[PDB]
Amino acid sequence: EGLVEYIDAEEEESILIAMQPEDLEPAEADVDPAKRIRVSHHATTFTHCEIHPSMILGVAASIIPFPDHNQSPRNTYQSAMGKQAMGVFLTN
Amino acid sequence: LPHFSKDDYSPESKGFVENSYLRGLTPQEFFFHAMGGREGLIDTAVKTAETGYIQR
Amino acid sequence: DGPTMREITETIAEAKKKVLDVTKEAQANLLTAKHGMTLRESFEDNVVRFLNEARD
């Protein structure tokens, strides 16, 4: 239905991707003193929006809580130790 | 990033994380940050044995 | 502190404009080349020294 597209790295070059679907859209006619300071959406050229930024992660980081709050080089470590913890690898 | 207007020489584009860890990085900030650390991890995994040669 | 987290925010905003400012003043050729450096390089050299002192 043309509501979503498969963008390879090459085609990517010539598109404009919006992060948050919401915020990066409606006009403007204060803010919370806690959240992270966000820049803007000063543009209307957008061609595509991000399903969700937390999708740029792969299996590893996906289990890491608030990976957006640690020193990146650490996340990279846990990214490895996970493949070394205990649990259940199958039920059979 | 493709999320940016061409020729943006500003800091929010060139990799300046204005946020604090207590607050949390935005995708962009979060990414650059990774690319930065990635360089770090690199030599800690290179200078590790070439340093040992020079030692030897 | 409640207000310190603010006092900082605006030390990045102002620092942001002391950049937007020298970017305007560069996108007009209204700056001279510090001997030995490229007009472009000299642009960075300031942006860098601006954000750093801000962050500091």
């Binding site: 990146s72 | 930065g36 | 860098v48 750093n52």
Partner: peptide
């Protein structure tokens, strides 16, 4: 350093 500044 890398993740703090240039010079750092």
């Amino acid at each position: 350093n890398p993740i703090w500044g240039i010079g750092c």
